[PDB]
Amino acid sequence: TRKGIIEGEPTCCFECVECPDGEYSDETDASACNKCPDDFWSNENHTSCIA
Amino acid sequence: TRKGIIEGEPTCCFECVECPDGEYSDETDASACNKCPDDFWSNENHTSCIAKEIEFLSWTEPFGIALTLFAVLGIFLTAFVLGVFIKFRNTPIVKATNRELSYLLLFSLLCCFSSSLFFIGEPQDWTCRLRQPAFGISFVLCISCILVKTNRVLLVFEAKINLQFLLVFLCTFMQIVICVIWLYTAPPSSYRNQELEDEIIFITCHEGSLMALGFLIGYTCLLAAICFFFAFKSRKLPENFNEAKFITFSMLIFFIVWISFIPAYASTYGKFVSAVEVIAILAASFGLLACIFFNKIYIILFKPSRNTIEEVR
Amino acid sequence: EAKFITFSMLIFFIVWISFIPAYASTYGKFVSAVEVIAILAASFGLLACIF
Ligand SMILES: CCCCCCCC/C=C\CCCCCCCC(=O)O[C@H](COC(=O)CCCCCCCCCCCCCCC)COP(=O)(O)OC[C@H](O)CO
Ligand SMILES: CC(C)CCC[C@@H](C)[C@H]1CC[C@H]2[C@@H]3CC=C4C[C@@H](OC(=O)CCC(=O)O)CC[C@]4(C)[C@H]3CC[C@]12C
Ligand SMILES: COc1cccc([C@@H](C)NCCCc2ccccc2Cl)c1
Ligand SMILES: [Ca+2]
Ligand SMILES: [Ca+2]
């Protein structure tokens, strides 16, 4: 999951938004979902890449 | 495009990230992209919601055009043969081939060629409910007439006991009983499909109970097998210009088509599934027609000098 | 040998015509599968009809 802006609040306050299909986020507090390289796709938990 | 967070910088300092495929966004400086509701999909620009593509085998698609053309050709041929027999209702061939059941058989062939047309277009509830029972009843009628014409079937039937109309009534009535139980217990209905591809919609019929369809198909195949067995037993008799040999040929064609049906149905994915159905129907129907009538047609219209009781032997 | 040649060709045509929707609506292993089946069917028909 990535961090989403809550309008009208500082940077500290955010929301958790699940990454879209084919995108992974291994690290906690990620500001951008990561694109799997070619020949790889996202998991069911959208954490890492599976060939 | 939505707003992403640049870490370590204030909220005024943001990044522009394009919406994913499925969600859209129109308002400027949007925080998160908006999910697009059902029956709707997002365009490439992810700015609005366009309608999903509803697709099915249609009357205007070229494949459906060809299917309709062949079905109509079959109907025309059946009507031609029926008219030829009706006009010659007293010539020796028509009298010997029991013109009443020939009229009934041509009627059922018309019904089969017509039921071939319920698989084209957008499926509705009545269409789905009529699809299978119509073909089942019509083809059981055809096979029952053929089975009556076959030699030694009638003698065996009366020994186990017009009687021929009783036979055709029994067969068709058993099929109608199956169809009525099917339509009463768990009728089929149309179904919209969105899990094949996320962007398009498939209207496919959903058969209520597969057990009833299995019963229908099995009974039709059983009748065909009985007819083939008896025709093979009497396959050398030159009666009716070797009618039993051509009955055998028609049954072989039927079985060949409906055995080829299984891999073709299994491998087909999408709308063309219904396609396969129609093709199978047509082939079987056409075979019947030819194997039962064209020879007789050729002896009557062209070279009509063999239309004598002696050669009917 | 008339009705044997006729039936071999009939099997050939029926097999190759019933698979048109599958060839027009399939990708990957299955399409190749279809080809093999068609081939085998035609071949068998020929043999079973002729010899
Ligand atoms: C998915 C399916 C697609 C396929 C579509 C096909 C669907 C339609 C099926 C069948 C129709 C007719 C089939 C009937 C087959 C029966 C033909 C047959 O076996 O007859 C033999 C000889 O006949 C003969 O002259 C044989 C003459 C051969 C003529 C048959 C041609 C069939 C053409 C149809 C093609 C249309 C496709 C259209 C697709 C767009 C028997 O003789 P015999 O040795 O006992 O002694 C007799 C001798 O005279 C005495 O010495
Ligand atoms: C319209 C399409 C999709 C299928 C319908 C079949 C037709 C193509 C017709 C036209 C030519 C017909 C054939 C023309 C001649 C004969 C000869 C006839 O020969 C015999 O074996 C009988 C003995 C004799 O004729 O001496 C058998 C039927 C058959 C094959 C007919 C069966 C039906 C056929 C194949
Ligand atoms: C073989 O004799 C028949 C008797 C009744 C119907 C038919 C044809 C017109 N449909 C086959 C039904 C095909 C089928 C098989 C399994 C699951 C769903 C479906 Cl749809 C043939
Ligand atoms: Ca504030
Ligand atoms: Ca700073």
UniProtKB/Swiss-Prot annotation, chain C:
Associated pathology: Hypocalciuric hypercalcemia, familial 1: A form of hypocalciuric hypercalcemia, a disorder of mineral homeostasis that is transmitted as an autosomal dominant trait with a high degree of penetrance. It is characterized biochemically by lifelong elevation of serum calcium concentrations and is associated with inappropriately low urinary calcium excretion and a normal or mildly elevated circulating parathyroid hormone level. Hypermagnesemia is typically present. Affected individuals are usually asymptomatic and the disorder is considered benign. Hyperparathyroidism, neonatal severe: A disorder characterized by severe hypercalcemia, bone demineralization, and failure to thrive usually manifesting in the first 6 months of life. If untreated, NSHPT can be a devastating neurodevelopmental disorder, which in some cases is lethal without parathyroidectomy.
Result, substituting residue 18 to F? In HYPOC1; the concentration-response curve of the mutant receptor is left-shifted and its EC(50) is significantly lower than that of the wild-type
Q: Which family does it belong to?
A: Belongs to the G-protein coupled receptor 3 family.
- Record annotation: effect of changing residue 11 to A: Abolished calcium-induced G-protein-coupled receptor activity
Q: What is known of its domains?
A: The extracellular regions of the homodimer interact in a side-by-side fashion while facing opposite directions. Each extracellular region consists of three domains, LB1 (ligand-binding 1), LB2 and CR (cysteine-rich). The two lobe-shaped domains LB1 and LB2 form a venus flytrap module. In the inactive configuration, the venus flytrap modules of both protomers are in the open conformation associated with the resting state (open-open) and the interdomain cleft is empty. In addition, each protomer contains three anions, which reinforce the inactive conformation, and one calcium ion.
Provide the coiled-coil residue spans.
none
Effect on the protein of changing residue 15 to I:
In HHC1; decreased G-protein coupled receptor signaling pathway
**Effect upon mutating residue 3 to A:** Strongly decreased G(q)- and G(i)-mediated G-protein-coupled receptor activity
Give the protein's biological function.
G-protein-coupled receptor that senses changes in the extracellular concentration of calcium ions and plays a key role in maintaining calcium homeostasis. Senses fluctuations in the circulating calcium concentration: activated by elevated circulating calcium, leading to decreased parathyroid hormone (PTH) secretion in parathyroid glands. In kidneys, acts as a key regulator of renal tubular calcium resorption. Ligand binding causes a conformation change that triggers signaling via guanine nucleotide-binding proteins (G-proteins) and modulates the activity of downstream effectors.
Compartments reported by the entry? Cell membrane
Specify the species. Answer: Homo sapiens (Human)
Summary of the tissues where the protein is detected: Expressed in the temporal lobe, frontal lobe, parietal lobe, hippocampus, and cerebellum. Also found in kidney, lung, liver, heart, skeletal muscle, placenta.
Which part of the full protein does this chain span, and how long is the full protein? 803 to 853 of 1078
Assembly notes: Homodimer; disulfide-linked. Interacts with VCP. Interacts with ARRB1.
Protein name, as recorded: Extracellular calcium-sensing receptor
Regarding how it is modified after translation, the entry says:
Ubiquitinated by RNF19A; which induces proteasomal degradation.
Transmembrane parts of this sequence? 4-26, 31-51
Sequence ranges on the Extracellular membrane side: 27-30
